[PDB]
Enzyme design. Structure first.
Site, short mmCIF file in Angstrom:
data_model
loop_
_atom_site.label_atom_id
_atom_site.label_comp_id
_atom_site.label_asym_id
_atom_site.label_seq_id
_atom_site.Cartn_x
_atom_site.Cartn_y
_atom_site.Cartn_z
N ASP A 166 -1.83 13.37 -2.16
CA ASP A 166 -2.16 11.98 -1.84
C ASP A 166 -3.31 11.91 -0.84
O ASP A 166 -3.13 12.23 0.34
CB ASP A 166 -0.94 11.22 -1.28
CG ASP A 166 0.08 10.86 -2.37
N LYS A 222 2.59 15.71 5.12
CA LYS A 222 4.06 15.64 5.18
C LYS A 222 4.60 16.20 3.85
O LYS A 222 3.89 16.19 2.85
CB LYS A 222 4.52 14.21 5.39
CG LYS A 222 4.02 13.25 4.36
CD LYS A 222 4.47 11.85 4.67
CE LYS A 222 3.85 10.84 3.71
NZ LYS A 222 4.24 9.49 4.16
N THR A 264 1.37 8.73 8.84
CA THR A 264 2.80 8.49 8.87
C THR A 264 3.35 8.86 10.26
O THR A 264 3.27 10.02 10.65
CB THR A 264 3.52 9.28 7.78
OG1 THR A 264 2.96 8.94 6.50
CG2 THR A 264 5.01 8.95 7.76
N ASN A 318 4.02 14.52 0.27
CA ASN A 318 2.69 14.54 -0.32
C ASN A 318 2.29 15.89 -0.89
O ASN A 318 1.12 16.13 -1.13
CB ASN A 318 1.64 14.11 0.72
CG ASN A 318 1.69 12.63 1.02
OD1 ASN A 318 2.40 11.87 0.35
ND2 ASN A 318 0.90 12.19 2.00
N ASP A 361 -2.58 12.69 6.47
CA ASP A 361 -1.23 12.29 6.07
C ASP A 361 -0.41 13.46 5.57
O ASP A 361 0.37 13.31 4.63
CB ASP A 361 -1.26 11.20 5.00
CG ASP A 361 0.08 10.41 4.92
OD1 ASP A 361 0.82 10.34 5.94
OD2 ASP A 361 0.39 9.85 3.84
#
Ligand SMILES: C=CC(=O)N1CCC[C@@H](n2nc(-c3ccc(Oc4ccccc4)cc3)c3c(N)ncnc32)C1
Ligand SMILES: C=CC(=O)N1CCC[C@@H](n2nc(-c3ccc(Oc4ccccc4)cc3)c3c(N)ncnc32)C1
Lengths: 801, 801
Positions: free
Chosen positions: A661, A645, A678, A648, A643
């Site tokens: 995260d 991005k 995501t 995070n 994840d």
């Protein structure tokens, strides 16, 4: 009638998938059906890149559904799970009527990827459908790919030329296997052709022709061409297929892309295994050993030959037997026989100037690897070998410690060079509990005991270390250290010397981190302050005993819909990297889970880039470089983040990053298949469902870099629909705006955003080294990054949330 | 590059079934496979009673799983979902080794019923399995049976002789359809045979032979034999099958078991529809109308005939046209023409002594039903028809009110007979708000307004009622009632008269119930007291304003794993029967759901029978009779209870019962399939998975009665294993101990515990009436039960929990 009186002995028992079984019906697949299916699937965004064997298997899993006029199929509100290809009749479509579909067309392709809420509502005007459910579809894709992988892997295992590849290296080239089909009578290879491909018979048979004469027949498992991966040679035979056949194939061009030079790789592995039998070379780094492999003199010898005799070959320090046997002599005494893979020379490797006293004599025809004084010097960086090996042994010990591991190379070297040596007698207290220390120790020779209150705690020996906290704090020693041997020798360094070398921002980072880490903390000792995150919930808390402020994430136990929290906690606790959030402790109770972590006060990178606008090259180097070190650290521990991005990533108050995260992170065991992430950041291979690994995190690096440098997202940028985002990811065009003027940036972005992982930079054998050495990073000092010796792009004035 | 700044616009995506897809593989089913399967299934406790078409369909859903040596299949701890038939190799079994299985045997049959935790652990010694998953298996059984039902139903719909059957009656005989298969050339019926079977062609074709001469050919949907269900007749033709054919068949012997006499049933339906066009007969009960149908004189008439003329047929009161047309005259004036299904005579039905003035004359050949003075008198119970219809009209109105509905028949009659009549002028206040009433009113003629504070609330007309609370309480009228018409007439009864008729225990029950029901209650008005149940949790609470004590069930919101709570609350709120728990209100908040109900203080029936030991006949009549009234009430509202057992029945302080746990109850829509209940009480048809209805509650009645009279449970009595309990239910032997000396009890128990529902007493057209009239209930007064006029078996001294 006696009755049972144990009152609680008897215990009671308690979308689209529901309605569609109403319409299911057995139906043999005639050719007319099968070909329409294949036609529909070849045009589906998921199945377009599949071979005929894959599409056929998918086809036989399609199910027949019959409908009468006025019947419903999908509904605008309901969550979707089916994909349909129309086989007869017409079907009307009604978002919020819109169209009409008949023989050949399909609908509900989005459900083939995820639990997408339907949009339209398709109903039967006339009075059939071929259909398939998501779970079945993705399970089928998983099994197809997973069995292909496993089979090719075992065929790789049976090819002798790959025997000395590591586990990781074997798996990397398994992924490079291409399947080729041969109709009966087709010639797989022709005699005299300078081919570069290895073939394995997975299924079928074939016939071997040498000079147009049948010489034998090949069965499943038979393989040929392993020398054509190492050399330019003509095929020795002509091989022709009797039966239709299945061949797993590896090309040399791909091998060279995935591994580099196979011979160079195999020899590093072999040499590394030999060198590491020695306590000396076991302290060398992987790169150092590879270098020694790349420069070792390899020689073949007849039997009864004197490979080394006293002063004859003056430059040789170490000797490795690759094939055959040799015998060792000190003067006229045999002292042993070395076979394959064993070696000799520790004494001379350590003492550069010492004259070779021994004799090595071949017992049979053999092959020998020789390490000379020049290989050693070249491997280490200078001619003073004895000193340089001692220096490097001390480097090895401290490069394992958080405190020293991330310092710049010049800082590390300065520290090593400042080491002093002292000796103790048995029962001497190197360290007395209660006193204020100022020194760090590494045990050079001997053993010591760790004791507190008379009670022993542990023993420590050669290369063990202790006392490092005295470099960072003024505090009492919590344990005594006692010389539990005759003549214990220690290397040591003074706090004063350390403080002359390490600079403020790194010192501050270490000071705050070790303290916080090791501090014992209880819930009632914690005083809440302001709140800083809603969703679970995160509070800025305040340890009463220490005044140390932390962050506390509160995850509502009702949110336990599952099992992944046990797994997230495992991963989050193990992480010990400067650019990854540091967990302190985890607390629990009746209504809520708790995560106690360091407090990070500089805000999200999501907001820093929107404040900077379009990043200059130095600024994108800094942040992408930071993310890369964090991601590399996780991959080394076989963790895929999944994840990545800007949302995070937090910035600490010095402006360095922290990954935070770990909800989607996973310890990978072979390929992963679960669709997680995501959408704008997800890799093609996750969507396509044929398996993925850690390298999806590298695709997302590319997405991030693109936002940094270009501004918008590279795919689905103004798309809302989850399906349209995925489609742009799978098949959309990647372009760069005209104001991007840096060719190296574009090259790197295009190569991180390469759709097939095998072409993706940083995804072959060298790993992240190919990214770190890209010309985009030309003027970038990876050394100073981890050591906090670089000015960050953006430093917060006070706290931000 | 503008970037999107809406931070929350991008949102991340997040047993045996898992491992078994590793071993799945496509495989064509050869005859050798199919026959082994059929062989295995015919011996399975679930599939043994299936026809070949059913077993074949199940077979084609089996999946092929291949295993290598040392592989696992099931594990001792894991929850089971698969059932396997071994196809090659040997498989070892290991509880906590135990055995070895090869070609032909099967394992994991328990999972074919429920999520049973495995016991053993089967692993592959050698290096295949035919397998099937529970969900797939039960889904297949559901679809097979459900489509068979629906198809047979529509074929029933197309057979003209069934046209006048009600919906419920059609569904009952659909269930009686038997499928027969005919190989080509087989004769379905032979000319001249006095057969009693109706045949419908569901699939195939057949040829019709009259006197050995081909007369036509029959296609799917063609049917024959509908007169053979009504009469003893020879087949008119010989019917022989060309193609293999599928016939839905109904026999007359089964028809008579399921419906009684078809002709009698059809005529009741027809007559009931005709009679209910009249405002008079619309007040009669279903039984009263059926009686009039059973005794009506049916006559055929030529055209132009005087069916009724003045004083000619002196006994006839009502006339119904069954076929044809007749014309009505008053003297020489035509006043109308009656066609099929219409009728005439309201005037004469009401005034027994009034002379027939009208003339009825056939217009064409017709068929007429005549209701005479004797049919009326016989239907009503006496010769004073005018009075008896008035009496019965008042009975109809109050039998709809809770307060009067459950009184004994003699009590009800006494009340009706005590009614007085009074008349009002327009604007007269029948009732003035604020005053203390002592009277109950029924509007005989006219209209009135319900008003409070000048503001109108409602209008009420003929047969409406008001004021009933004044019979039970001394309290002020909460509304005024005003004569809003010229000459309003009311029937009324005085509290004093009511109190002379109703007896203490019924009065106490009504007093406590209406008060409690209608009282408004808020959470903060409620004071908790002692606790009386742990699991959710149930507290004895105490309404502060009224001092009325209630019970409050507190259901932890965390227990919401689902949707059925919305459905349980619906059912629990609608229930308004003396032997079913009365819900007051439902409350909700952050952490917990709430049920406020009446408080029941006499304990569980589970404990009362263990205190009584073995019930005498009167004592088992009482409790089983009580349960029967409750269950009958639910079935009338199409609710199946599904968890009947002594645990779920409480005793109120007078010793009468209350049904309480509606967790497993469901409003049925066609057949139910979900496996729900308590194993010892579950009906065979629930387990077998081919669909069930309300009649599973009747099977459990049998289980209960058996415990009452015999002592232990009838099946699985000392069994722990869920599977062994089900097996004893499906195929075990029902026996009775030697100390059971009542033949009628045994007859009733054997007939409630009949495994096929169609043979189960109380499950045909008469419903519970066949149980109430069983000789076991010979000396039992169903009348006094509901009215609390019977001494219960056991009355509590003080409260018990
Ligand atoms: N916006 C949101 C805010 N935030 N969040 C954390 C944080 C803390 C712990 C954590 O749990 C793991 C386990 C990982 C995840 C995030 C956080 C933090 N540590 N410090 C400051 N703001 C934080 C800033
Ligand atoms: N043991 C257990 C105890 N109990 N339980 C109830 C009760 C009350 C409400 C209800 O919720 C519906 C909704 C149905 C279910 C059971 C109950 C009760 N009403 N009165 C006394 N004991 C009770 C006696």
């Amino acid at each position: 009638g006696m009755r049972c009186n144990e009152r609680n002995k008897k215990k009671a028992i308690f979308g689209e998938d529901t309605l569609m079984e109403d319409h299911l019906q057995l139906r043999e697949k005639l050719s007319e059906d099968i070909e329409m299916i294949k036609a529909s699937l070849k045009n589906n965004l998921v199945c377009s890149t599949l071979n005929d064997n894959e599409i056929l298997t998918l086809s036989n899993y399609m199910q027949f559904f019959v409908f009468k006029g006025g019947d419903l199929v999908i509904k605008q509100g309901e969550k979707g799970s089916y994909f349909f290809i129309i086989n007869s009749g017409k079907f009307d479509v009604y978002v919020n009527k819109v169209k009409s579909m008949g023989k050949g067309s399909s609908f509900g392709e989005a459900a083939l990827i995820h639990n997408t809420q339907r949009s339209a509502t398709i109903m039967a005007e006339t009075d059939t459908l071929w259909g398939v459910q998501r779970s079945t579809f993705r399970a089928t894709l998983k099994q197809l790919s997973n069995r292909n992988f496993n089979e090719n892997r075992s065929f790789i295992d049976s090819v002798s030329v790959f025997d000395m590849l590591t586990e990781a290296q074997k798996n990397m080239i398994t992924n490079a296997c291409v399947i080729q089909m041969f109709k009966p009578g087709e010639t797989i290879v022709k005699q005299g052709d300078y081919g570069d491909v290895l073939f394995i018979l997975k299924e079928g048979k074939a016939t071997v022709f040498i000079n147009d004469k049948e010489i034998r027949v090949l069965n499943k498992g038979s393989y040929f061409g392993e020398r054509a991966l190492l050399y330019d040679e003509p095929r020795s035979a002509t091989i022709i297929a009797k039966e239709p056949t299945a061949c797993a194939s590896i090309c040399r061009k791909l091998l060279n892309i995935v591994l580099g030079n196979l011979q160079v790789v195999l020899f590093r592995n072999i040499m590394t295994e030999a060198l590491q039998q020695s306590e000396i070379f076991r302290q060398f780094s992987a790169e150092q050993l590879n270098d020694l492999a790349d420069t070792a003199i390899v020689r073949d010898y007849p039997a009864n030959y004197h490979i080394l005799h006293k002063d004859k070959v003056k430059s040789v320090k170490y000797l490795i037997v690759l094939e055959g046997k040799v015998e060792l002599f000190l003067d006229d005494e045999s002292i042993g026989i070395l076979t394959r893979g064993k070696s000799f020379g520790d004494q001379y490797v350590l003492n550069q100037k010492q004259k070779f006293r021994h004799t090595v004599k071949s017992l049979d025809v053999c092959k020998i690897a020789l390490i000379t004084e020049s290989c050693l010097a070249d491997c280490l960086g200078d001619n003073n070998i004895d000193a340089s090996i001692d220096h490097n042994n001390k480097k090895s010990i401290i490069k394992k410690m958080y405190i020293f591991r991330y310092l710049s190379e010049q800082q590390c070297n300065l520290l090593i060079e400042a080491f002093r040596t002292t000796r103790y007698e048995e029962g001497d207290y190197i360290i007395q509990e209660g006193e204020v220390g100022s020194r760090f120790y590494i045990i050079k020779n001997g053993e010591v005991e760790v004791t507190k209150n008379g009670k022993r705690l542990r023993t420590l020996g050669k290369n063990d270390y202790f006392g490092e906290r005295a470099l960072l704090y003024d505090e009492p020693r919590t344990a005594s250290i006692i010389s539990k041997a005759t003549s214990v020798e220690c290397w040591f360094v003074d706090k004063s010397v350390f403080l002359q070398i390490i600079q403020g921002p790194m010192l501050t980072h270490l000071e705050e981190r070790i303290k916080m880490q090791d501090t014992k903390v209880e819930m009632h000792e914690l005083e809440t302050e302001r709140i800083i995150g809603r969703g679970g919930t995160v509070k800025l808390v305040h340890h009463k005993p220490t005044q140390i402020r932390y962050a506390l994430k509160c995850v509502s136990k009702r949110s336990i819909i599952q099992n992944n929290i046990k797994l997230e906690r495992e991963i989050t606790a193990e992480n010990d990297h400067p650019f990854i959030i540091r967990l302190v402790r985890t607390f629990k109770d009746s209504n809520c889970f708790y995560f106690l972590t360091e407090l990070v006060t500089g805000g999200e990178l999501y907001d820093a880039i929107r404040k900077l606008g379009l990043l200059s090259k130095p600024q994108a180097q800094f942040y992408l470089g930071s993310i890369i070190l964090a991601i590399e650290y996780l991959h080394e521990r076989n963790i895929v983040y999944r994840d990545l991005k800007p949302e995070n990533i937090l910035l600490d108050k010095q402006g360095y990053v922290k990954l935070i995260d770990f909800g989607c992170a996973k310890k990978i065991q072979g390929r992963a298949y679960t669709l997680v992430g995501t959408p704008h950041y997800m890799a093609p291979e996750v969507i396509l469902g044929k398996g993925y690994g850690c390298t999806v995190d590298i695709w997302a690096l590319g997405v991030c870099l693109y936002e940094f440098i270009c501004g918008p997202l590279p795919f689905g940028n103004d798309q809302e629909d989850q399906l349209e985002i995925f489609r742009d990811i799978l098949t959309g065009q990647l372009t760069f705006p005209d104001y991007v003027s840096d060719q190296d940036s574009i090259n790197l972005m295009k190569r991180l955003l390469c759709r097939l992982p095998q072409g993706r930079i940083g995804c072959s054998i060298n790993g992240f080294k190919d990214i770190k050495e890209h010309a985009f990073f030309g003027n970038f000092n990876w050394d100073k990054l981890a050591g906090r010796l670089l000015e960050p792009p953006l430093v917060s004035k006070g706290e931000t949330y």
